[PDB]
Amino acid sequence: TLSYTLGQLAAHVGAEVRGDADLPIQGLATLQEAGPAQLSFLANPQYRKYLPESRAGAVLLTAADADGFAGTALVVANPYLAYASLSHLFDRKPKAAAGIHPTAIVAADAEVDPSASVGAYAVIESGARIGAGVSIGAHCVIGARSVIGEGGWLAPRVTLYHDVTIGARVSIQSGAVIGGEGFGFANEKGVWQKIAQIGGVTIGDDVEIGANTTIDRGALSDTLIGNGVKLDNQIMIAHNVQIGDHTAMAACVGISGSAKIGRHCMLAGGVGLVGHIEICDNVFVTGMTMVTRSITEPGSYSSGTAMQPAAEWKKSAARIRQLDDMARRLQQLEKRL
Amino acid sequence: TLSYTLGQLAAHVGAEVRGDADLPIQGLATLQEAGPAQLSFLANPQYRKYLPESRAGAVLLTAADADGFAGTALVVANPYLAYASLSHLFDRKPKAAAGIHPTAIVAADAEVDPSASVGAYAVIESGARIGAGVSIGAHCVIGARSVIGEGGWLAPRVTLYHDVTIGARVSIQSGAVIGGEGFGFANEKGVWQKIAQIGGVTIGDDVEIGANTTIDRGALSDTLIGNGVKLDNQIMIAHNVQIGDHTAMAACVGISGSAKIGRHCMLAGGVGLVGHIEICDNVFVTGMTMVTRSITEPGSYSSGTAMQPAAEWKKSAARIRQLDDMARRLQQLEKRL
Amino acid sequence: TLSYTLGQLAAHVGAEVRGDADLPIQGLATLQEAGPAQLSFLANPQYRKYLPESRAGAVLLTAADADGFAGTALVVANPYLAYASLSHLFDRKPKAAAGIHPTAIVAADAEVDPSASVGAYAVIESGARIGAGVSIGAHCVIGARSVIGEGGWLAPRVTLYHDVTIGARVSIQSGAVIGGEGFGFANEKGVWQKIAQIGGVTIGDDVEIGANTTIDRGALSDTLIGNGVKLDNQIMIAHNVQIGDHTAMAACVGISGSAKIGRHCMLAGGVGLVGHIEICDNVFVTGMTMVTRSITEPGSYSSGTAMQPAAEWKKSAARIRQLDDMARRLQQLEKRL
Ligand SMILES: O=C(O)CCC(=O)c1cccc2ccccc12
Ligand SMILES: O=C(O)CCC(=O)c1cccc2ccccc12
Ligand SMILES: O=C(O)CCC(=O)c1cccc2ccccc12
Ligand SMILES: [Mg+2]
């Protein structure tokens, strides 16, 4: 097991020990799943009720929660952010150290920093470029002239096409496909005719791309993902979308061709965006919303209906089908009075 | 071709022959696509009209349907369940018999039952564990310390991360990713900060996982899939979801972080569940529903609207935008009478 | 760089030069991103305002737009379709010329036209059949007795199962899975029992299949994709669906078991179709629509609600919950007058 003292861990997030710093810790855990060997935290004002009964060894707490506290504490401004920081010290994910696999193919035109690792059966086409301390997983395919900046981590079975440019510290889960040819077809008298896709992709720094997520290449200009953009799993980004820095998109979100999302935007799960619209900075879209027109006011937007028992849903739908009569009924009365 | 007598096939589901058991059969087919060489069935009271004209050789039938029947029958309590049983005898899917491929990599720390098969270019990291009569397809990646119980069938290009524990008789279609790092980020003054994902996955026995489906690893505790849980394709299960045994989820369903589904639940296609809610046992959610709050009453739940021609949809939406006036109009009249 | 004269390019789409045909061109570009080295076009009557200020070298234009035009033009009936045609001459996607990779496995029972290419670590099972001038990418898996007609292009990490038959000039982006076993289970007293999937797939000619798209094999008959059918990314086609020739489906669309779509149909993004319904020819379904019943009238169909600010959405939902009172209120008044 990986284990550390409260002192080593307090050091990492600059906390104050309020028991004994000598106490070993072997992993992290929620308030009411935590053992004596484990560090927890209170982030939610709500779970304030559940703190005393925790068998946690130690607890990341604001000075306020820590005050009159039965146990040993680690005191910090933001427990959750400290929790977030500490989480990496307990990550048991393997880290295949530097060098290529004999199996992995690499074109003679491909630069590949010595500090980087390429896993089994990998492939790397002509003009590729693997920046420093990058980690490329097994069965990954990098396409021609595609670029992963330093600190990148690509899980196995990730595919880049030709002409995909990525900043530093990229994180890409398995199954991801970047630079694919999206729907582009013209209608010649009711037959679809292939518009070839001759843009590429450009992705800034510190970007997460979740598993089985697809990002289409541009039609002419590049598909643009800004810096610190966090994309969950099963996401679809069409050709020529632009995403503002620090925008977060939850799972199963689909953005149509040429849509532009400003900065610090949050799209909840299974949001769709029609093509050729613009979303201004600081927009929250609630889950399974269909965004149909550009957004200029920052704030929160929804579509959908209240969940009901199916029977009540049928009565609602029917009450909705009779709105016309009700407005006819209501105009006949408007006359006589 | 694979072929069998009505007797061999009656044996397998303990049916009564009501023609001659000597009659060869070469495959199965629907009532009104069936040839003389083929066994059909009546499961639907509805298709009772379509039975006489069937050119089926033989028909799995309840005693009731079989009575006064022109053709040769196989009599059973449940034709459809008998149909289901017989279906496997006509499955032409290859079965790469035991042993590893020279190509496949296996770490020295990995146990791999002799009875199991590992296909071309496979990969198996340190501390892996391939139970007995498991079948691992080509380009599969098993991650470190991950465990497939006996009878497992993993199609090609399936990915397990580190620390994925799976019961017996697992069936996983291609493209599936289990143990991926889902969206977990804290907001440091408008920048997303990686919460590392240090849970794993635990999956019980007799579980189906469809193609390109993703199951996230836990943040701290494991992601939990109970026994006999049937997940269609393109599904997304976020970190720390719990699924009750015998729950079925149709394609394109997305379950957010920490949601709990009880047992014998049915989620129709493209249902979404917001995070941190609980669904009690025996809930049916109709297709493309957004479930926003916990469910305590067993039964059937919906959201969405009646499909209309687009023009009528526009008149509905407009009739809905004027509900406020209609309640103002209706309060002015409420006064004077 | 690839470069061509206006004359060579006018030749390809039979246009009339209305400056000098000697002028080299190095790529294509939108009206107001175009440099002097680049050919643009006016397809949209809307962007007619943006033509004069374009730094485009040359512009594909209808005679009408070209008339009194400051720059050098290429004159054609349909600029956009000419644009579509020309686009392929600037496609920088690599093209791994004929022959197999030493790495690639091929069964002795597999025919593989000499004109075709199979990339690194590919796999091709018994009874396969790679028609002429087909291109199979790295890590592709073709399953047993599956057939790609001539002119096919399969990106890397594409998976075919056993018994998948495909016409000519197929285009399949990465991550695609064709012939997977979809949800098929019977309920034996609340336990799901595997119905084996013993149909295959049949796909006509000139078909696009986008990335991470899944197409299920048939239960008994084949899954059917007609000719010139264009499927975007992240799409799910259940067992035994039928798609009419020239039907287009945008990204994240999900079609349930046994649904039939006629010809020249357009499904916008994230449309769902319930199983066992029929859609007649020439139907447009707007984005994120749930189609619940068969469609017989050609035209345009919708479900969903108008996007609102979340607050207004809450007032709408509440105004909708009080429709019953409003119809009670409206019946009490209907009495007294
Ligand atoms: O659920 C939360 O409350 C936050 C994350 C989120 O938006 C999400 C993730 C996955 C599937 C979903 C389905 C419906 C609504 C939301 C989601
Ligand atoms: O369609 C049925 O009636 C049963 C299976 C099912 O729920 C389904 C599967 C795939 C896509 C869907 C889209 C909308 C609604 C349902 C589905
Ligand atoms: O958006 C257009 O206007 C045309 C293409 C399209 O229908 C689309 C593509 C991807 C995601 C979507 C989400 C919602 C609505 C439409 C889409
Ligand atoms: Mg979806």
Residue numbers in the entry:
A (entry chain A), B (entry chain A), C (entry chain A): 4 to 340
Show the paper's wording:
LpxA and LpxD are functionally and structurally similar, sharing a homotrimer architecture and conserved active site features, especially in the acyl-chain binding pockets that reside in the dimer interface of the β-helix trimer core. Herein we report the discovery of several small molecules that bind to both P. aeruginosa LpxA and LpxD with μM affinity, identified using a targeted structure-based methodology that utilizes molecular docking, surface plasmon resonance (SPR) bioanalysis, and high-resolution X-ray crystallography.
Our LpxD complex structure with compound 1 (2.60 Å) showed distinguishable electron density corresponding to the ligand at the dimer interface formed via crystallographic symmetry. The fitted binding pose suggests that there are two hydrogen bonds stabilizing the protein-ligand complex, both with the backbone nitrogen atoms of two glycine residues, Gly272 and Gly278, from the adjacent monomers forming the active site. Additionally, compound 1 establishes extensive non-polar interactions with residues Ala253, Gly257, Ala271, Leu276, Val277 and Met293, which may also be critical for the hydrophobic contacts with the substrate acyl chain. Compared with the LpxA structure, the ligand’s aromatic ring goes deeper into the LpxD structure, consistent with a slightly larger acyl-chain binding pocket in LpxD. Two conformational changes are observed in LpxD upon ligand binding, one being Ser259. In its apo form, the Ser259 side chain normally points inwards towards the active site. However, the naphthalene ring of compound 1 forces this residue to rotate outwards to avoid steric clash. One of the most interesting observations in the LpxD complex structure is how ligand binding in the acyl-chain binding pocket triggers movement in the distal C-terminal helix, suggesting possible cross-talk between the catalytic pocket and ACP binding site. Our complex structure suggests the possibility of coordination between substrate binding in the active site and ARD binding by ACP. Additionally, there was some residual weak electron density in the active site of LpxD complex crystal with compound 1 suggesting that another ligand copy could possibly be accommodated, although its low occupancy prevented it from being unambiguously identified and modeled at the current resolution.
